Amino acid sequence: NTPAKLGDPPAEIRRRRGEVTVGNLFRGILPGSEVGPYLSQYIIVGSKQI
Amino acid sequence: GIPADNLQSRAKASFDTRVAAAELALNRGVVPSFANGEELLYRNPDPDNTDPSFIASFTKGLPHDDNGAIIDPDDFLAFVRAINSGDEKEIADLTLGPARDPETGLPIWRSDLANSLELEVRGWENSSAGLTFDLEGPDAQSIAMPPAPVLTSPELVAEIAELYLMALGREIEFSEFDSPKNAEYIQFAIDQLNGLEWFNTPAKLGDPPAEIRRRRGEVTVGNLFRGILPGSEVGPYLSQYIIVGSKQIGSATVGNKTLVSPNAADEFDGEIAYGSITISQRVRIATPGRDFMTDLKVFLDVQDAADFRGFESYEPGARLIRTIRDLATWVHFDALYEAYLNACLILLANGVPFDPNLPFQQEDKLDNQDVFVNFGSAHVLSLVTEVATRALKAVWYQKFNIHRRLRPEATGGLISVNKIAAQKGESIFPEVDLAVEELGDILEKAEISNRKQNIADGDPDPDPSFLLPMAFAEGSPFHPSYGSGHAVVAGACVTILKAFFDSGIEIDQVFEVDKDEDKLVKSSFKGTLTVAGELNKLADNIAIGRNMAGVHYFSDQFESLLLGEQVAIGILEEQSLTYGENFFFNLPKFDGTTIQI
């Protein structure tokens, strides 16, 4: 609920998280993780078949 | 075949070990040092003139005019050449001091005092030590201190304000910082500093990272005149290690029996057991209220190399450090690593355990091995002292070869000359206009204090003087302000001690100096202090002691502490190749993180 402050370790600044929402609850912060469904397509979909 | 390594002769293994340490040091790479830009920024104000004035550079020793500016820019440019060359003849060819009398050969001073003493000049102290190599640790020139604050900066205005407040506060007793008798002055100091941008406004995104790290916020009685190393701002001002004695010979546990020294009480009266003899923590007592270089002519003489060393008066006897001035006296003459060797002696006498990540630290029934030469008392005693000269070489490079920052006395001189001229509608040293504009209340107190000093010194009707009063008759040493020899050595030595000892050990009883007598009293502090915290505080005490004497600014000290820590870390890393045992030093660093070496 409070942002990092100038002078904090750069590693903390990069990984600090802000307001929790249903859309980000229990998610990671890599780019792409916070958009669309929680689970990656690659852990639920199958593939084109022979 | 089974992969293997091979033995070689001992002599080749020793050679290869030393080369591998040199290679480790080389492989760290090097970084440049950047100065703040002032040296060629400020120009001679004379219209017909194309020279820098060098007014923000250390020029102590070169001949100055009546305003404190050097007379001939070539004198400083030659000094810079000699600094980078180190050649003895080139050094001997410099101009040092003012014109001399043909008949006596003596310097002709401005002040009746210097002329009556027939003072000679003193010279620069190892102006090229920054060129010296070392067999161990980071090379002097491989590391850097960041640019010093500029004269026009909020940071410098804040620093010089602080130094005047320390000077005018020299008779304040540490144990009485928060006492009613000092409330008016202490609150004036707090309020004045809180009225300055550096302290009342935060750094902004984009400011230099070094500024962000060292910038200070709201001034309080709890942080007034303190450092910022972790531990310094908790509990009493003075480190335990600069006022307490130690356990004494005869106090021991022998199996199930406790023996008590017949001299046990000496521990609580400032006696460190020093082998079978003692060190007393009691400091010599400089004459209270007597400051120096409060007269412009005497000040200029000192700027022109007049050797006032040894001119102070003292009271009989000695006492545990009592006033701000006493900490200034402590750091006037201390022998290199003295504070930290003394802390080390206390830790050893009191049986504080070594870092438990070193070998052989278990009870001997388990490891069959006690420690002495390596990982024991003799080891730390050598290592804490040996780092000092390596740290000095590095800070000397920053002092003379890179930054050449003017000492606080010289800044005070610019402020005084500026203010005096402004009162007559003339602009001299506009570079310090902001400090003059913002520090009026402090400068008025300085003026009154200086007039009293100048009357004491035998001047029936002194000219107005806003000079920064010096605790020492000669003012600063004969070397530049940035960084500090004291502070770099503090940083290196306390790094060693924190690494070598179990520096998470908590202090059992906390003491302060008594308000009424020359003795120790139990502190009313009700938290926990650690060895590491108190070692940091000790470094801050010796470093700020220089500030309280009038000879360094806050930034000199803190940046020098960081430089010294780097030197000691690098020595430990290189030495790690020399041992067969499986171990490391755990070092809690000044930044709050730990490195395992």
Added chain:
Amino acid sequence: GIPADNLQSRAKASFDTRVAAAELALNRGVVPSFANGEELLYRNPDPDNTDPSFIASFTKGLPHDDNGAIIDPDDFLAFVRAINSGDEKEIADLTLGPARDPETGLPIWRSDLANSLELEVRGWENSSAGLTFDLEGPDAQSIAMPPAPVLTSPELVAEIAELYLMALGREIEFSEFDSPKNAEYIQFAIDQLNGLEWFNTPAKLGDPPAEIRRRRGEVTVGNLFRGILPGSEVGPYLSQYIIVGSKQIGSATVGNKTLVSPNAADEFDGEIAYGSITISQRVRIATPGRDFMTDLKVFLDVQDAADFRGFESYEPGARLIRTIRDLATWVHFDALYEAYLNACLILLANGVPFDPNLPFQQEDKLDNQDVFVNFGSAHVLSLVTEVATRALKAVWYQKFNIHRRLRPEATGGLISVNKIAAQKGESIFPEVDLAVEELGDILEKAEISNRKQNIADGDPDPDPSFLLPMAFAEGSPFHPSYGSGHAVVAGACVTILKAFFDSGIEIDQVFEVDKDEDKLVKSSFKGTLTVAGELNKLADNIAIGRNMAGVHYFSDQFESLLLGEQVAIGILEEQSLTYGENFFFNLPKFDGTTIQI
């Protein structure tokens, strides 16, 4: 084209400098160390046995039989393997101390005293520090000490005789060596030693050159219990630097004016100015007449690792070193380089000039240069202390990896057991038959002294004991006799100070401790002492102090002094590559010649 050299980056120049120093050290070459042949010479006397006895080797800590011989030769052979390996597990696997009680886990001692204290064992002190490399100076293993005297030799009989005479003389005051009240004992000591071949017959052509150099002649009151370094045998027994204080803060010459410290008299009352605080030369006072390990059961327990450290009692207060015992106490607990750092602090406070072959030592009006980091106070303060651990590594290699000589207490134990058995017509430890045969008069005095001690310690009717009385409850440190940590550090540190200071400077006023009070008196000595002479004497004082405590022999100390001098010389040589200036250290060596480095 004109021949030239070329510049390279600072980082490469630093690397190349460190490599060049390593190459200089490598190019010195190395020498082997030779032991005296005893380790496999002496055999277990039991007829059905093919083991060495190791009786002349240091075996403190390994379990001994009722005669003081180790029980199991494998315990010593494993200890030797561990010394050469350094491996922590292998060290932890050794046998230390006697059988332990199944219920309590505690060692079962022979003596009621050790059992009543429930003493635990103490372990070897860095038994493999001789394997450690160093970033500077000669590698620990590159240099040598010559073979130690053998038990059957005239030299050893002389050494052990001297140590018993020192032990029985512990209450004699240095100031009263020539006083009528001491004439009987002093003349007995002199006559006894003069009755021994070592002192009354010269070396012969063909004898080892090391024996020739260290052999002593006629014993006199003027040389009794002294060392042989040049300077030690002239003037008072104790070096000025271990009894006098220094010039104090406030005494100074400022131009044409002389200021006098309000504390000036502290100089003559044993206070060294230590920066702005002080060191007291006054030593803690061990209980007069109380010696240790005079009972065989307690002695054997100590031989079996019983940790008696800290068991001594003291009188209240402190005094300038007064008796032989006081010098023993001084060296019981001194901190590494303490004596020499203290001498350095005296020389600095008193303004003794540095070696005039260093740069920048002229008046600054001539050279424009004062000294601090290099060639000044900070330089010597680090250099004097840093050499200590390098000297210790070298002597540790000789102690553990090469010679493993038994400590004097162990020799006294052989003598006592031998004599007691001989009185009952049995031969035990015939190796010390010559000492027993020649030292009858001294051993009779020891017997009487030991009976009194043993009665005082609570045994109403003690068995006869001819043990060498120890000044310390634990006797020697937990490391071998040859050489000495104290003496190697003395040799290295005083080498530094002699080189760094102008050590031809003559002493102005010579003091001694007063016969009647705890104060200094002007000596009646009429000749001239020099700084170098008094630094040598200081080294000999610390070194012989160990002998007077019962823990080293003459040869251990003298050969260790020479080893330390080599270490310090080598460090100076290697460091000489790091400086740009044109200079050298002039060093007057212990052999009377001078080396310029």
Added chain:
Amino acid sequence: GIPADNLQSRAKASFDTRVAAAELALNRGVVPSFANGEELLYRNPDPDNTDPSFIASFTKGLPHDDNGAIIDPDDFLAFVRAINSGDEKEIADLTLGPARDPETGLPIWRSDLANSLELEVRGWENSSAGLTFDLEGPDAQSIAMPPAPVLTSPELVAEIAELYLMALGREIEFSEFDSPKNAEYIQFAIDQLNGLEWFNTPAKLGDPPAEIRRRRGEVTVGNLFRGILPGSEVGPYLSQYIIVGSKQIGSATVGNKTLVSPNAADEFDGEIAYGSITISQRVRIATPGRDFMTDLKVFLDVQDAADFRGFESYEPGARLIRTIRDLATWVHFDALYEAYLNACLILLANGVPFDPNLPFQQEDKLDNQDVFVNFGSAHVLSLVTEVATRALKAVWYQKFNIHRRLRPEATGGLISVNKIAAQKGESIFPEVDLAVEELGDILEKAEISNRKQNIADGDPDPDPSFLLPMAFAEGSPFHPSYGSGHAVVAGACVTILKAFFDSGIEIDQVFEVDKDEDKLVKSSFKGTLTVAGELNKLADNIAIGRNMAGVHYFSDQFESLLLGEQVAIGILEEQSLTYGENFFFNLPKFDGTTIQI
């Protein structure tokens, strides 16, 4: 001094370790690769022509005439130049495919089918990967495969005979090799092969050692279409690891308690526990009886780069490998190391112990150490997969840069064209006269089979065709026959698994696929199989699967298995320098001996 080695920085130790591995690889030396001599032996039959024909070289993709000989020898010579250069422009400049239509830009094919699909060309697959270096393992070019069999050799006649019998046997179920309904065909195959000199006559003294090692003897039902690695010829045709599932999550022993997965039966129905999900052993079902490239025009189009990839049809669903064709389908699309990763996952799920010569494999109460990153599951999972691409580079060098052997389809094409011409009294491709002469009975069955295929494909009255029917619409990959990507990877990967696991562990229950249903049944085999044997069998299964598809000959596969084993061994050897622990891999090699690495 005591001989020693020395430490250096970790970064230098890492560098030196990598260099030492490179030096170990360099110190193995290199061996040349010799081709069989055919490339310049066979000549264009045109009298006025001085060119080689390249008929026994891989020329798939270059334009061929109506007999399957390349039209322009320069096209192959340029392709060889491009193979040795690797330059992308030079590759792009080659001729690929036949003349193209001006208006559409499309290749003009011979067959109505290829034209109706408007097929484009496909290109060579990394024709210069044999130039690629690798950070680990033997360089691609440092090792060799021996010369391939020549078209005129007994070995080749035997190989091609076998491939036609496999093609015509594609619908036979493994479980039914010995069944009455298959007796006529199975006995025909056995008798035909036993009628060939390669199998019915032994090698003779003086023959190449590589021929002696790989030569096969009497064909039996028990060895028909099997490999010769040790273990392949015992028990059921298919390795356990390509039909059985594994222990499932939920089955476990916790102390004295046994837990049973609720899905435990999945183990015996072809489900491998793959982490917490599953792999099914059931393979997709290519349309039974449908083969490809049985028409000369379609065959030539494929020889001219027509991209038929993806043209096959399948039945719905999946089944445990049932027929010869199913094993061909399995190897049509398998992902690199898939078979061996799957075997590894079975071994891990089933708890098969690691090689007991690795560290830490004891119960943790004894060694305090479990395994994962090194010497455990993660280690083998990376190592088994990483060897694949290193093995591929080496076999690609043999494929393209050294041997360029024609794929079996091309040999079948020479045989068909020869036989058709001979029936009209013309001699074409006399190089394959011996195969034509000796394989009449097999070729007659192929003719009948091909007519049926060609009718099914829509040609009501097809020309006679003796082409080798392909399991895959596109026939071989776009790279030469000798060696095999599948087989070299099999050799490398199973070498890793045999070394990493305790591959002497015996298989408890042996399964086969049921004759009547899509399920596993207990085998009636009596005898013992081991993990190593079944891993060898798995390698032989994947390798022969390519033969059964029509795309490799026996010699390609066996010689590739040996090459891959060398690659994996070399990687293990070089990696052995990276670990501190004391251990080795025990590897049972394909030749029956064991190497400890």
Added chain:
Amino acid sequence: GIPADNLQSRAKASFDTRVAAAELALNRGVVPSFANGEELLYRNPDPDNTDPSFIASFTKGLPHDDNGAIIDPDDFLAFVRAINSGDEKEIADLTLGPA
């Protein structure tokens, strides 16, 4: 003459490639790793005790008291030594599990 490079044997080119990759990795330099300072910060709360508690360190496997703090600090200190050594005997000598 025209500037050129030169060929060498394949085996030397392979060696030189692998050395060049090692040199590339070496030339990246290295950085230290800093821990958070807790390991020697937190102390055993017992008044007569000068040991760290190691309560914020991973000590799974070492014997713990009824509160979850390790019983003997030497067990964690030995574990740390074994971690830095890798020697199998030293690892086997640790204390693992309860009495």
